[model samples]
Target: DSFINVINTLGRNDGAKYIGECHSVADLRNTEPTMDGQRIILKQHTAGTLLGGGVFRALIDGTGKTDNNGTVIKTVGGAAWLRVNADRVNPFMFGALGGSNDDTIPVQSCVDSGKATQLTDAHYVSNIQLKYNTSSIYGSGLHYSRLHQLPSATGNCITIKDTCSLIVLDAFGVYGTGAQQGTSFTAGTTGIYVETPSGLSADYPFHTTADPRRDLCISKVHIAGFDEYGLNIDSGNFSVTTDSLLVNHINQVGVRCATTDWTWTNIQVNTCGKQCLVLDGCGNGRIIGGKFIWANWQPYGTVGQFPGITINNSQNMVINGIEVQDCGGNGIEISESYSISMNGLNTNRNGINANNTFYNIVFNKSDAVINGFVGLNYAANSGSGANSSAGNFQFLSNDCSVTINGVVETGYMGINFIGDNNIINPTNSDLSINGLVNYSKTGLQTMNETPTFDGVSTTPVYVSVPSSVGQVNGLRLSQANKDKLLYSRTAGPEGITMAAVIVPTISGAEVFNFMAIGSGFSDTSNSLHLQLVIDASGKQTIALLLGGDGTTQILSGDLPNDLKLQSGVPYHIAIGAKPGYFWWSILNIQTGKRIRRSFRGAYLAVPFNSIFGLTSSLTFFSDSNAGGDACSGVGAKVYVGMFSSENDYVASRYYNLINPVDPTKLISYRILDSSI
Candidate 1:
């Protein structure tokens, strides 16, 4: 034969132009080359180690020699036989025995050969690196082909190094030993990592001319048990697409893609210790049909954890058909992002750690629009004291423009506009919500100082009831909102009728003020207050106060048996007010019992317009800390209506606002349009 023949332990024999073959790298180094292009074949470069065994062509360098591996090396007095004809290669050819052994050397050599590498069905241990362009790897199937990180491996199981383009990894599984590497899982291994190590315009160049080496594709890959991210695209300008990917048990983020222009489809990231997916500094991307969940995995059990999906400092991202649930933090969080749109999103039981800042969806300085969002079993934000101001959705920065077309929450709390300033610190932001519905038994309570809205419908989507003390705790009614309260009066004296649901949370002798219908903070004579006061001896009394005096009970009353009003029970209070007349009644909604009725009086000195402060048309709770009377338990919801006649007050439909708290009702809160 004119060609050399190379035989391997696997019994692979190839025939080529006749040339003598060397059994080992040492023998090939000792043999002298007669010409510049002299050829030789290496068989089993090192015994029992499948590496450096390939067909070679001599370079005839003055100072070159064969290394222990069959490839070239610069040494005195020998020819360099460069490896060649490696269009299709496999680790098996390099003596990488499939099971129970570390195949790092053979596997890495095969991958670095710049060939189309084929993975074996059997498990292999290696941290593979690919640096050249057009590098491709394929396996029989995702389940059959397995690449486990070597125990000594410190980095990623597979790394596409700097500026490498047109890389493809398909139909394979990459795994880490992090789950088996102790409690802390400090192995710090990633399944597949792609990074641009150098040659960048800036450290985090958000806008710069695209560099070479772009376009990566990862398909049908299952990555799991990594201590770090399953797939970490640290920095790049490449357009990457991941399809049919599943990541599990990642100690850190499941996938953190910092590159630009990515499309992810049909992905399920399960049990991530931190965020399931993070897009950082990415220009544009689309995530479609994915489920990102956190099942309280290790670090995620702690409070103040990350979200299921976090986007920061990115723009032009669109998400569709995504469900995120059981997150210890927010279901989805965006910060410093712009031009985002999401549709068909659902979240469940997010923000489990109960931090005041957590919510189902939170935006900080981001411009986004969402349609069709449903939140089931959202974390309780109200009645958690300081976290009471939290909401199912929150906007936390100034000038953030967020809009939701249809959002339904099964939680009691509504929307929050709490800036970093405080619970009710007014921030100039735009929050527009339509088709907002709440299904919790308790009513929705919104905490916002000032916000702008557009495209809202009959049921107000926002309400102002800050859980904490603020200068103002009520929403100043817009002309449109006030019109909802105005009614036609007929034969008799016309006045305002108000109804409210109150649940007190105080003990003996504490004053639980409910609602204050006031002309102004300083107009004591025009203010009317409702409160639940317990005597020092533990007698609960319901009282109606005229003027701003917290101690003065205009129409004093007690239950039928001098019974004490029960704490935590929902009570309905109805008040009818006209010029020189005041009448009130109370009912225990839970038990079909009327507590009190007809504490009627002729306050002939009081003016009609001044009664219940109808002239001010601003109804709110005074902040007790601000040296004004306010609701003690913060469980009062007041609805005021203007009636044409005294008989119309009894027949008013606004009494429907005092309906029993029933789960099936799916209560809708009247959200204040602060744009007014």
Candidate 2:
């Protein structure tokens, strides 16, 4: 059914392309017309009468009112009105209001005042009024005249391209009755939608020539009541560059994609059923300055499985300055990406989890409730592999380097390194503990090695005298210094002749004292005897036995008292003078030999003035018969020195000879005047 009317037109002088025009409506039923270059106009009108009756109606198809079957109509021109009875159950009788043949003269009840108006010039209507019967109400009369079922239509409503730069649908409203009523209207579709050429292909949905350009701006718009996704650009090489003003009450993903190279700034998504944003198999995108909130919805089974923002199999993406709260799952999850940087993502959830990636990742000032798992979980060629273990706080497998700073809570093991031969810098690494703790099972443990110490200074010196040379007495004798003594080894029928050193200091006036001890062998005897040979010519000498021979004295014999020298043992011997009655003593060091007991005495008239100097010799005795054939079995120690007898003789009682030099202080005398 169609209705039309022409009211006014502008003159040719008012920028009018045509002088005058006539408007009409036509229905050429069953005959198709090619409307290639045709233009048509539509107008609405209202009825004026308020009486209740079966009003006269007409059905105009082409020219006339109706056809033979009271249904089809024919028309002779391009304009006509096709109308039908609006009320058939009511009948009324009236005069002049009724028509000649059920049609009365179309009366203009007033000039324009009866609720329907017409003008002779082009004009605008500021307000419109619609009237309906108020008697029959559906549920409540509050919306009796204004209530209307919503329109149900789905698909793209608006599309823009290069030729058409801008498209705007301002102040649009979508309404639908509740879904519970079976006969009620369904939800209205959308306000402005974009249909790209790639959507028809199974491989790509955003690859058309009319894909969003480098700078697409969507602002001050409301997007809600979506069943699948609010904004979906799937599998394309293009980007959706838009600053989403408002988005709420979405069903699936608020924003979803499968390609790469996209950017979104200042996007706010509130009350979304599923993830706020999802990027699958996409890379090189940036999401900055966004706010996401989830209310009364649980997505992906449990809170641990849901995610506010998820990027899968993507690389080189960045997310900055995004604030998210009250989410069901992790705030952000990045999987299988190379380089990802998250600057200031303040989220309240299970934190950001990165599963498998290669390159560098940095998170600056992100605050989260729970920390995400760091490092690769397995051992692989890319540093962190398939069988590698997880790092505690920051795990490094097979020598991958990672550094973390400004951490509040210390993990179980702050940083664990499972590879061999890793170096830890103790000075630069900082760790703090709350209580007394032990780091490992043992403080320090070393295994299977020898330790060494180096660098030191001092050694040992030894002094000894053998017991082969027999004892001597008081002639200023020493181991090397000998005076008035002859030391020699004798060989006779006696099994082995021993060596001896004799001294003449054993005179009655010069009483000599002697002592001797042994070194390599032991001695068992009562007394040691000696052979005294006093020669008055050059010097007088005597030889004493250091070890005894039982009966008669000989030139050499073992000393007394079961004493012998052992290897590496030491002994001491001294010889000195006592008084006019010259006496000598022999000491056995092994038996504690002393001079006072083991000695012999001799008396001599020669005064001490006749003495000159004492001397001694060191000799070795062989227990064999021949020179080379006889090896020395014993060695000896001999010493001789001077003594004074001033207290007994009184040194020529009348002469008073300048108190003879105190022998204790006097070591030896030098002739001041040899002539004296």
Candidate 3:
């Protein structure tokens, strides 16, 4: 009766074909005839009177609940599912086939629904919105896994290669519900896979320039717990669009988009196993108003963590007003992209907690903006809850503008710029670091211009240049929870190593000038030592005594005042050249207690990659016994260091250093550590 009527009615001249009230799943999988200008309606009644035992039922094509040649199995459900093996039709569609008798609603069904609801069984592995072609997959709760090698054999393989042209899966989700097992995808597996090389109908291949669907828009939905990327959409040669998407707790990333010229917006991901979002190969696009957060990480910096949002290899892109925080790595990491303007938020990631918005109590000298400025904290160090991450922003490419408008909450670190290796100024941009950075405003301002810190923690904020090697900057930080240590890298304590920055070893004059606020040497029984090496010719170099019980037995006995290293103090340091003598000095910038030393050095064949001793004040590890003081742990820390240089002429110019006539020529650079 069902088939006969479908065949009889399919030939009618009516503009729309109507059918419903199928007795079994096998009776409903029929291909609606190619109605050149008609829509196939699968109108159903209320959800309570639907045709399945549970909340949903399937649309089987076999005699009973079976799977074979012409049949596709579904979770004993309904709401109209279909097979699209036929040719083109106007807005080709599907739903229960029936023109309801008591049809009061336009849905044309008995129980009363606008569209049929699709359901699934944990054991069934198939897509609810199967086959494609100018259609809208509505009424959600659909599930399909790539079903790999070791998966539940009964449902170990299902992929939506190309779900047809103009396909929109609205309010659709598949958190595999059943007695056991999960629907998590592996590293490369995806919940919603697009542009298939294979899966589902891989062998038969549905994609065709013949009837292509380059655009994929998934909105109004919450997809979660997939094993891999929630939405992995890549374009082979053409392009596609992915918008209004949201994902949570996926194994790797939320959305990994490989299409250029695509519209990516309103994306949010939570507790991401790896990264939140990555939009690579974008030509020119706007990635705005999204929050890609938390690698939901719990590790000891022994490995590198991924950023919340990574948009790389693009041209003229605008990333605006998004909040990305609590990241395992950086808030937003932009690399190898050109001409970009990024102004992002910090807190808005979690949505609740007003403290979650970013930079709670902000305080700075005030208004006017400049670069390489200095900030002081006469106040005590923050005793609690402060940000421990080294950087909120990290730029690896060139020609980028970063506008920090969001208020960073307590304890968050500042920014980092690592580009073009060690040339210092690989990328430069006009920065507008708001939230009070003008000495003119607070009137209590000192000699300062930029380095807009996040909160009012007397922790002495600073921007350290990377290995001084033509790259980004550096950091030796541990998270607020103090669980991990992050430099400009992704490795463990004993495993931290950065590539040596290239330098002109044979160049005429090189000078090293910088400032530092040592992180107080409280463990006096131990020794703290780090150096600044010229990696120069003739073995001439300089070193800074972060702390100790004294190292110089100076020709005879120890120099009395040489034992003057203290805690929580600012110091000015420099390593200069005087042709024959390596001039160097370290002075307490606060009280003026100073030390002067000289190491006779020479140079001829200096390599482009020589570790000028302590190229990075961070390159050295903590050694309590380097000076005979055998205690366990660090002695002092240079929490701040910058505006330093490397040149010729033993410029012993001590801590009382001043701004040379034209300060613009000063060098401040970054060295890359371990980054993906």
Candidate 4:
């Protein structure tokens, strides 16, 4: 297997042999070939013919004008482009070793303007240029970095950077340099950039976890973007793997992994501006199957956030069959990230207009688990006066396997936790949930689970608040041995919370609806008791979670309709239980404000056969939404609604008749085009 051509026969050329000199391509980077099938033949532009320059420029240690003070001086084999010296070289299986008989070099090179036959002419002013940063890595081969650095380092797209690890890239590609392939149906405008080296001692010899799996590999091919991050795992990547990948057109975050232990399989991320696949501070990762689309929405340069994928402060991760479409700051936003496992996700949104689209899924301060979710869809942003603002599914306490479900939305609720509780617009003109930075549970109490994505994945409808169920020494609901209701870790013993006295009390003004998602108030057991602020629990625990009992009470608030359950905040407690008419009130379901005592009577019958875990254990899980701070958190639970009727119903036909993504049983939204 032989083919070689170097012609510096002192410029009269045509004299090919044991090697050296077509004048430049560095005479084809000096030469050390030996994978045993050896081949190198470059010289084409057919327009002016040969030097393999076809428009080239790389000057420093190796060629021309040595000194006259003209100083083009750069050092090393002096420097500049086409340098393949792969000293410690490593290229796997498909090329018998370091790919050269390779993707094919059995002799090839051309600048062809008219098609074939050994050409070489395009360089007039040297349109193709190289030699940047003298080389510690990838100035490209010969004395520095080069076995094509990992297919596309200096030209990037296929760049993992720094001391680079053992590597592999399937189906190679890169435009602007080393060309060939109908010139370029375009595998690059450019992508990937990293700064790895934080090594050589002082700690981090690949930081444990059984170290050793380090070789930046990207598979299948055509994975480069328009601007950056076609695949940028950067930050000392440890274990990495990707299956079918064909990402395109990105300016920011196409596949931006912060690189912990990573793995992605079969993905298709087209059109991205921000977040197509983002794993910020990554951990054990896995993204099986993907199709995340978010693009040029609204205008070219505007004020819109952009989402489809974003998993911040990562943890044990797992993402299943993905399909999040035409996104904008809504479809998916997993904040403060925690143990994640998502399955068969179809954040479906296709008209019926709730604002266009927003919140098919949201676990803002997340500890996630989703199984074959076709979970309620529609609420982050729909269209025309859009404020459908986030709905579908949202959680607080990790144990949300419990819920306000039964196609529920029974009412009596509040909404005011403004900062990053990220409700998108559950009728938010600033219902206040944004304090304590990005969520803990200042509020998140409201219930409406079955709103149709066309039914059946179950779970999502919760509101259990008998004064936050401190169990005022309570217990009822005969399923006896399998009974329910525990405010904190009730895995075994510690049962018995008795208080059920509703023998038939439904007469006169009996309308019911409840929700309580905001916490703070110690001293319990004397009747959800209260009087005088024993030092205002975190300053009025959000005005006692919008039902007020924390000082200057009157719809209470030192402003911001107040659900001030601070400490990492995440809130939304809704209630509308107007018992026995003239008194017994609690309404704040998106600002209808009703905190009662005018007639406190009838309808205190706490007994229901099944399903009720209104999340928010008031951060008993110790929340954190972060600069990655806030830590082990999630607390804010108390949403009680034994369903008696709106208790006050017309809270404006209850925000579109018991709505949380409209349920009557429907799941009809489709858009599929995935390729692995």
Clashes of each: 13, 45, 78, 102
Off by over 4 Å in 3: 1-131, 140-163, 176-188, 196-213, 236-244, 299-303, 347-387, 394-676
Query: Candidate 1: lDDT over CA atoms?
Result: 0.57
RMSD of each: 16.0, 43.0, 20.6, 21.5
lDDT by residue for model 2 over 168-218, one digit each (tens)? 211121112221212222233322333332422222223333333323344
* Residue-by-residue lDDT tens digits, candidate 3, 1-676: 7998877777788724453443343444443223232223332212323422111233433234433211122333422333232421111121221222211121112111212222221222333223444444443332331111223322212233454554555554533222122234433445565554332333223454322344555655555655556666664412344455667666667677665555657767766656677767655566667766665333212145566666667556666656666555544555665565554444322211121122111112111111221111101022122333421222342233443433221211111111001011111233333322221123332231122111113242223332222224322221121111112211111211111111111222222212221212332311122242333342323343332122211111122333233322333343332112222344443343334443332221111111122222222122211221111111122211222222210111110121121122222212222221
Instruction: Quote each prediction's TM-score.
Output: 0.55, 0.31, 0.41, 0.29
lDDT of 1 at 542: 65
Residue-wise C-alpha lDDT for candidate 1, range 1-676, written one tens digit per residue: 3233234322444434344567666666677777888666776565545544677787777452435343453224556767665456666655576677787777776667657677875555657777655467788787668687766666788887764566678888887765332334436688888866566434222323334335667888888778778988877646668888988878878988887777889888988888999889877788889898873354533334678888899998888988987776777788999998899887756655554445667789999988887654433323222321123465678678877654342322111211111111222456554522222223555321221221213343333443321212333222222212211121123555555554444565665545445423333555555656667877666666665322233555543333456655555565555555555545545542333323323322344344433333323333112244444332234444443222222212112224322222212223222322
Give the better candidate number (3 or 4) by TM-score.
3
Q: Once superposed on the true structure, which residue ranges of model 4 sit more than 4 Å away at CA? A: 1-271, 274-327, 332-357, 360-389, 392-525, 529-542, 545-676
Model 3's TM-score against the true structure: 0.41
Better of 1 and 3 by lDDT: 1
Q: Is 1 or 4 the stronger prediction by lDDT?
A: 1
Q: Sort the predicted structures by TM-score, highest score first.
A: 1, 3, 2, 4
Candidate 2 lDDT for residue 546? 38
Candidate 4 residue-wise lDDT, 114-135, digit = tens: 1111101111111111111111
